[PDB]
């Protein structure tokens, strides 16, 4: 049996920053989801469109594993219909999103006493994002009416999360994996057992 590499997605040593979230395609494999919905390691596990008791035996053309690191307090923004700094400028899910949002506390992996500033998020943008878009430009953001000229009310659009082991839970890092599912006119390639 050719099993889908959910292990590799969830056990990755490094996750992308939310401003530049990663995407991996899962196809032409057997998707065993029993390893995801039967564990207590996740703090968040919520599916939209398809029930966890049904997706286990449904066939799809693609499963997209989108992954990133955000603050625990911002986990609630990773949902259809949501708004906020992450939902609007970093990672937008469509109102008709089908798939599962899975997240867990990674305070023992992604934070340091001296401050782990290697995880960035977009703080400013001229407008919000299209669902599943990605914007990794670093063009200086002009907040006011004064031209930035590439360099007051002009900001480097990204900011770091000061992730530290002593932060309270809402300020601890969370690893988020969003499995977006779709069925196209194309023949399905990803079936469960």
């Amino acid at each position: 049996t050719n099993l889908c590499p959910f292990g590799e997605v969830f056990n990755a040593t490094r996750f992308a920053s939310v401003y530049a979230w990663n995407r991996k395609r899962i196809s032409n494999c057997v998707a065993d989801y029993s390893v995801l919905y039967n564990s207590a390691s996740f703090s968040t596990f919520k599916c939209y469109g398809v029930s966890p008791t049904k997706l286990n035996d449904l066939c799809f053309t693609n499963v997209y594993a989108d992954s990133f690191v955000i603050r625990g307090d911002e986990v609630r923004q990773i949902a259809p219909g949501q708004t906020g700094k992450i939902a609007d400028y970093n990672y937008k899910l469509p109102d008709d999103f089908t798939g599962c949002v899975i997240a867990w506390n990674s305070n023992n992996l992604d934070s340091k006493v001296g401050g782990n500033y290697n995880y960035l998020y977009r703080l400013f943008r001229k407008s919000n994002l299209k669902p599943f878009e990605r914007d990794i430009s670093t063009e200086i953001y002009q907040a006011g009416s004064t031209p930035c000229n590439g360099v007051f009310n002009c900001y480097f659009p990204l900011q770091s999360y000061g992730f530290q082991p002593t932060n309270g839970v809402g300020y601890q890092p969370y690893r988020v994996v969003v499995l977006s599912f779709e069925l196209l006119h194309a023949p399905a390639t990803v079936c469960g057992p």
Partner: antibody
Amino acid sequence: EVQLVESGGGLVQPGGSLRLSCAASGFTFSSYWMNWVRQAPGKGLEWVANIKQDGSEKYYVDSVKGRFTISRDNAKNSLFLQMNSLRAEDTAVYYCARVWWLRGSFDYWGQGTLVTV
Amino acid sequence: NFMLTQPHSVSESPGKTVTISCTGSSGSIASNYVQWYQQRPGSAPTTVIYEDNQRPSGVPDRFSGSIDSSSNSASLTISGLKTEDEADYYCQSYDSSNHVVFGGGTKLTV
């Protein structure tokens, strides 16, 4: 048609022990999680213990750690709960319940075993 | 620790509607699924609503519900109360900090 049949309750002295069990029929244990849910007289429900399909992993409410042990025999279609060092706090009816997946619903409940201290 | 709370006493005349809330505390109710149970006095609780807003076969369509992320709360509503709908209703959700959390329970009369 599924049924959960509890037994092994009754009175128990403070500081003692009793083994509760819950026989099942109509379904296979290999496909379900089993849980115990406690209901003190006149109060709402609270969760006590959880065992997964293979018996390889167990969870408990923190308030019973070191006092309760959950186990299951897939061949005998019987769930067990061994509870030691009971206190007055522990008087309750104990329901066993079937859960399809960990974070999902408890879609079938037994009638409940009365345990008093 | 994450916990759910509920109104103790809820009631309304038959034929009218009722809302039974469940609010989160020191955690997000919307991060997991919310279940609702109905326990008639004298017997075991059964599922009425599960996975936020749906219901198992055997449950009439007068029982519905939703989760309001912005209020960190969830609720079920009953329309067209029947005198049959006399029970203690409970909300339930899962957390990693504390595995299964049941709400206090709402005593509903008609």
